[PDB]
Design a protein around this motif. Structure first.
Motif, mmCIF file in Angstrom:
data_model
loop_
_atom_site.group_PDB
_atom_site.id
_atom_site.type_symbol
_atom_site.label_atom_id
_atom_site.label_comp_id
_atom_site.label_asym_id
_atom_site.label_seq_id
_atom_site.Cartn_x
_atom_site.Cartn_y
_atom_site.Cartn_z
ATOM 1 N N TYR A 137 2.519 -0.337 -3.351
ATOM 2 C CA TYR A 137 1.720 -1.062 -4.279
ATOM 3 C C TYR A 137 1.197 -0.122 -5.300
ATOM 4 C CZ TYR A 137 -1.163 -0.004 -0.334
ATOM 5 O OH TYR A 137 -1.719 0.606 0.809
ATOM 6 N N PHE A 172 2.753 -2.569 16.343
ATOM 7 C CA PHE A 172 2.381 -1.301 16.877
ATOM 8 C C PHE A 172 2.646 -0.149 15.975
ATOM 9 C CE2 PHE A 172 3.864 2.545 18.989
ATOM 10 C CZ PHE A 172 2.804 2.849 19.807
ATOM 11 N N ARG A 173 3.913 0.148 15.650
ATOM 12 C CA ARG A 173 4.048 1.359 14.906
ATOM 13 C C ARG A 173 3.462 1.204 13.555
ATOM 14 N NH1 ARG A 173 6.587 -1.813 12.690
ATOM 15 N NH2 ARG A 173 5.284 -3.211 14.078
ATOM 16 N N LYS A 174 3.785 0.099 12.866
ATOM 17 C CA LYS A 174 3.247 0.031 11.551
ATOM 18 C C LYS A 174 2.051 -0.840 11.587
ATOM 19 C CE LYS A 174 6.212 -0.274 8.067
ATOM 20 N NZ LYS A 174 5.580 0.802 7.270
ATOM 21 N N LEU A 190 0.471 3.688 -0.513
ATOM 22 C CA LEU A 190 0.075 3.275 -1.830
ATOM 23 C C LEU A 190 1.278 3.085 -2.697
ATOM 24 C CD1 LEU A 190 -1.875 5.338 -0.508
ATOM 25 C CD2 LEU A 190 -3.018 5.489 -2.796
#
Lengths: 165, 165, 222, 97
Positions: free
Chosen positions: D27, D16-18, D24
RNA sequence: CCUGUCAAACUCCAAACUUACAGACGCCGUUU
RNA sequence: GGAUUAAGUGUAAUCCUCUGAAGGUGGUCUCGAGCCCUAGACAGCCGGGAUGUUGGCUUAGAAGCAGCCAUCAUUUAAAGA
RNA sequence: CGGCGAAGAGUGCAAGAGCAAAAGAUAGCUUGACAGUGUUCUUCCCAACGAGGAACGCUGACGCGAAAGCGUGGUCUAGCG
RNA sequence: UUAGGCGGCCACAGCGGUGGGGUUGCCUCCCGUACCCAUCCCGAACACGGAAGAUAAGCCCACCAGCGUUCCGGGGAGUACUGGAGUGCGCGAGCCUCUGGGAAACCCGGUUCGCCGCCACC
């Protein structure tokens, strides 16, 4: 003050559902030489028993308005069939166009409506700054204060050209 | 019958209607007795129905042991006093030896893998101390309702405690 | 807040400022005076006002080396509306020749330049003027055809900074013309749109702004 | 059926939250030579992903091949060889305690 | 609005615990 | 040292293996809870279980005691329709 | 025509997972569904084993973009000898 | 930044609500389509051009806790559950003691109406 006053933003006429200009492109002809522009729309909802089951639909709908085209239209517009021009007829928001509704699923939608007042007329009334709500950006919401009232709405138009009834 | 390899939980989930069909309907009349609506909760006198055991009474268990219960609750003049509540539902489905899955005891059949038991009945399960089905009114009599559940218990695999109000 | 069952995405978000999923877009191409956490040749639009910025990001910062914003113009130049394209070619052009090469423009810093043979001298740059660069991100905005956003890019392009962009996704000229079509190079501003609204019934003066641009390309103060 | 997305269920999934895209920064971050990095798969990724088994253990980054960094669990698999095959992006997290 | 219940193929939560790596102590190894 | 048990309960950790689930005991010991007591309890124990009147209604009957209504009055040391 | 409306209307196909200035829609352009050769993981946890698959490179040649860049087929895990 | 841009953590930041702020420094709303560009129809949006006018929206600032969320005190609770041990109890299901850990619901009272980084800026 002048801001508070109510004026008509976009009206737009419309036509009935079904194919239009069946014999030849027609029915658009009406709405033509009337209102000045020529809209056309399409539909969804494939299987209709006595309708088409066409998907993208030729379905006639159209018109819109502006300022001043719908004035000089909505002139010699109202003063057309109105057994009861107004009353219960339009509602909280300001203006409407209707007749007798049917038990159909309503309310949870954007609320476009079947409702037919005249060849379903759509006077929509809004005062104010209101371009606020509609416009993309911080939309904002109408105050529910400086909102149209049916009473105020069944004013303005009535003061001019025709009785409320 | 008899209920033996039925109410001991040595299995795990489902009910799952997705998974299972052909479930027998419960023969457990409504789980709302007496006058509902009004909050019976305002009452002197209290409750009962504590399991004091482990689990899984079948609907066959509760439905004649509960209305059996209600029957001698009728004493309080049909519609005049108490509300009866049942707690848990018979969700939980059980399967019985259909010779195709495994071997030996039930939930095992013939062969290996294969026919899980075919659906036959459902039973709610309960814990050591839960209230099977409660509710009361003012001390109508000494405690007709207390008499109720005497009969109510004595058709449950568990030994139910009356539990004082 | 809420039950906090939900997590809210905001940062810059919540009330809008930056976008994400853009502005990430920009950044990858390391641009700015130097390596940037986020770099741009921002173009913002305001009622009655256009702003051009330019600068690499900081952890906390998002600094800007040199700015424009027609408003200041006319420092020299002239009094007219600033909510038009012309006068949004001037800026974004005036910023160029500020950000574009003054404090410093595309990646030019003291010390050895970024790896690659690159030397910059006054006058036309040796080994190609190609290295000058910035990416211009309209903020939340809509890409259009000849739009002021783009226009801001046009000047502040021929201001020395070299930004990628797509031609034919500009106003052409006319709305903002070049004085002479045979030579692309020239400072050019036009405000044809409004002009010819009337023919030359009176009022508007496109002629004044070419005047501005004339001043721009030249030795001017700040 | 059998495949990369084998029984994972929670390990792969981020809730849910994430949800949605991730920043970016992770990565883009670079590691150099022997740096102990943990391995995992942040969900909301669709590239630079390792297998599923072996996720959770640290490995030592080694040189990079293509846009991806040799890392992976350089570290041993089970009680065993540091037989390592690493093709992980910075997208999966680095760092050491 | 009050009120009565659930989930192997539910989850706003959430252990014990299992587990990658490192340091420390321990133990072990450099004639075993 | 102390207490319980009278069933040979039991003298059977675990278990294919040692069963016992939702017969009886004022034998005796121990523990708890309610109510009643020196305004004298139980026995507590012993003895006794008023007139209109079979109250009105109902009912085949309905006499304190199926049910409904009423629940007064008298004579009392006292005794409810 | 207007208003309300974070999403109940997508992504070829199971299930689970991924995705919103997109991976979804629309429009346009294009053929990277390219040739060659690797690294690694998987197949086969640990722990050897082929075909097959995938991730990630390089060399060569292209496409699209302002550019970073993306493209080693169809968001990922089946569709093989 | 007496109002900006790019972010990190991603509800302590959400939902709802009160009050205050500018007019020429900012952000907008706003005004307007010659141009670059744009709507399967609409300069609505996107794009461009511009300042006649506003603070009413947004935004920024101060603040409220009713809902949601975070953390904490006290209570629940050293309860539920549990790693290790036991010629402790019980017909048995199961329970108990010692040792090492230790919850959830809910209640009452506080906390939370974001925190932080870079840059630019009367």
């Amino acid at each position: 003050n002048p801001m508070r006053d109510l004026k008509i933003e976009k009206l737009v006429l419309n036509i009935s559902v079904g194919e239009s200009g069946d014999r030849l492109t027609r029915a658009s002809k009406v709405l033509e030489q009337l209102s000045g522009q020529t809209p056309v729309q399409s539909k969804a909802r494939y299987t209709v028993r006595t309708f088409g089951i066409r998907r993208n639909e030729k379905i006639a709908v159209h018109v819109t308005v502006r300022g001043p085209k719908a004035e000089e239209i909505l002139e010699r517009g109202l003063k057309v069939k109105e057994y009861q021009l107004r009353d219960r007829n339009f509602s909280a928001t300001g203006n409407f166009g209707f007749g007798i509704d049917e038990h159909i699923d309503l309310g949870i939608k954007y609320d476009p409506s079947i409702g037919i007042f005249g060849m379903d007329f759509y006077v929509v009334m809004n005062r104010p700054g209101a371009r606020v709500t509609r416009r993309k950006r911080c939309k904002g919401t109408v105050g529910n204060s400086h909102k149209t009232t049916k009473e105020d709405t069944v004013s303005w138009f009535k003061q001019k050209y025709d009785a409320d009834v | 019958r008899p209920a033996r390899c039925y109410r001991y939980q040595k299995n795990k989930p489902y009910p799952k209607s997705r998974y299972n069909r052909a479930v027998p309907d419960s023969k457990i009349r409504i789980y709302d007795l007496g006058k509902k609506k009004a909050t019976v909760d305002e009452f002197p006198l209290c409750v009962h129905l504590v399991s004091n055991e482990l689990e899984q009474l079948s609907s066959e268990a509760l439905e004649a042991a509960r209305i059996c219960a209600n029957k001698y609750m009728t004493t309080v003049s049909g519609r005049d006093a108490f509300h009866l509540r049942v707690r848990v539902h018979p969700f939980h489905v059980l399967r019985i030896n259909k010779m195709l899955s495994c071997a030996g005891a039930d939930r095992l059949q013939q062969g290996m893998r294969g026919a899980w038991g075919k659906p036959h009945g459902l039973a709610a399960r309960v814990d050591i101390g839960q209230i099977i089905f409660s509710v009361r009114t003012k001390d109508s009599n000494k405690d007709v309702v207390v008499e109720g559940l005497r009969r109510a218990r004595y058709k449950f695999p568990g030994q139910q405690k009356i539990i004082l109000s | 807040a809420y039950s906090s069952r939900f997590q809210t995405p905001f940062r810059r978000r919540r009330e809008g400022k930056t976008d994400y999923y853009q502005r990430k877009r920009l950044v990858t191409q390391h641009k700015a005076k130097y390596n940037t956490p986020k770099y741009r040749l921002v173009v913002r639009f305001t009622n009655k006002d256009i702003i051009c910025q330019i600068i690499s990001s900081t952890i906390t910062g998002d600094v800007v080396l040199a700015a424009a914003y027609s408003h200041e113009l006319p420092r020299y130049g002239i009094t007219h509306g600033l909510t038009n394209w012309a006068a949004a070619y001037a800026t974004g052009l005036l910023i160029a020749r500020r950000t574009l090469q003054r404090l410093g423009l595309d990646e030019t810093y003291k010390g050895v330049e970024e790896v690659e043979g690159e030397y910059e001298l006054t006058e036309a740059v040796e080994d190609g003027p190609r290295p000058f660069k910035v990416f211009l991100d309209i903020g939340l905005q809509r890409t259009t055809t000849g739009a002021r956003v783009f226009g801001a890019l046009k000047g502040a392009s021929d201001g020395g900074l070299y930004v990628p962009h797509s031609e034919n996704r500009f106003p052409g000229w006319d709305f903002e013309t070049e004085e002479i079509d045979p030579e692309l190079l020239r400072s050019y501003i036009f405000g044809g749109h409004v002009s010819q609204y009337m023919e030359e019934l009176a009022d508007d003066d496109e002629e004044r702004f070419s005047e501005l641009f004339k001043g721009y390309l030249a030795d001017d103060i700040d | 059926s059998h495949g990369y997305r084998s029984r994972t269920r929670y390990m792969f999934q981020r809730d849910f939250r994430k949800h949605g895209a991730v920043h970016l920064s992770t990565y883009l971050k670079v590691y150099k030579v022997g740096d102990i990095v943990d391995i995992k798969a942040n969900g909301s990724i669709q590239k630079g992903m390792p297998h599923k088994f072996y996720q959770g253990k640290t490995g030592v980054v080694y040189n990079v091949t293509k846009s991806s960094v040799g890392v992976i669990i350089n570290k041993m698999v089970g009680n065993r060889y540091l037989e390592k095959r690493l093709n992980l992006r910075v997208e999966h997290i680095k760092h050491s305690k």
